[PDB]
Amino acid sequence: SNKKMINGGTVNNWICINFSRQVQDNLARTFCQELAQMCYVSGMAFNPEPVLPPVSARPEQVEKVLKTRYHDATSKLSQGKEIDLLIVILPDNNGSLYGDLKRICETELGIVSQCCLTKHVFKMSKQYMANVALKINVKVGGRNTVL
Numbered sequence: 711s712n713k714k715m716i717n718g719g720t721v722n723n724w725i726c727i728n729f730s731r732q733v734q735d736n737l738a739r740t741f742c743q744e745l746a747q748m749c750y751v752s753g754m755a756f757n758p759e760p761v762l763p764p765v766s767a768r769p770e771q772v773e774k775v776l777k778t779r780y781h782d783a784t785s786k787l788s789q790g791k792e793i794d795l796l797i798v799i800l801p802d803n804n805g806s807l808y809g810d811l812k813r814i815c816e817t818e819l820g821i822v823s824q825c826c827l828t829k830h831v832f833k834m835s836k837q838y839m840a841n842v843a844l845k846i847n848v849k850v851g852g853r854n855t856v857l
């Protein structure tokens with residue numbers, strides 16, 4: 711048996727930010743759609759569409775891009791609703807970007823985030839997607855089986 715979802719969590723509102731120069735907008739878009747689909751069919755409630763389309767940013771602007779995109783997306787929601795998930799596409803080798811990302815999301819924005827390496831965005835294998843869905847589920851309060 712592979713791990714599966716016991717209780718599927720809910721992602722009604724999400725956005726994507728891309729930090730890889732090898733990834734065009736449409737590919738980030740397509741990647742997130744496949745991930746959203748996997749999350750759903752695994753047992754989550756997961757909106758097939760993001761609050762805002764993906765945006766591409768330079769790692770040097772991590773603080774600015776995250777805070778601005780967070781503000782703009784949140785202001786788009788019905789009053790009192792909040793963003794459930796940020797999906798981040800990042801370069802295979804990213805130095806301090808991963809850590810910066812997590813510190814900002816954890817301690818300033820208070821948003822759940824899922825990082826995805828460029829290599830996986832190009833391959834988009836079903837096994838990868840299933841694994842990332844499992845991680846997302848736990849992060850938003852769902853529960854998975856144990857082996």
Ligand SMILES: Nc1nc2c(ncn2[C@@H]2O[C@H](COP(=O)(O)O)[C@@H](O)[C@H]2O)c(=O)[nH]1
Pocket residue numbers: 800804808809823824825826827845
């Ligand atoms: N743990 C960790 N993962 C990283 C780092 N940089 C990129 N990643 C990628 O981020 C993914 C995990 O993302 P998370 O689930 O923490 O949002 C891993 O698959 C890994 O490929 C890093 O510095 N530390």
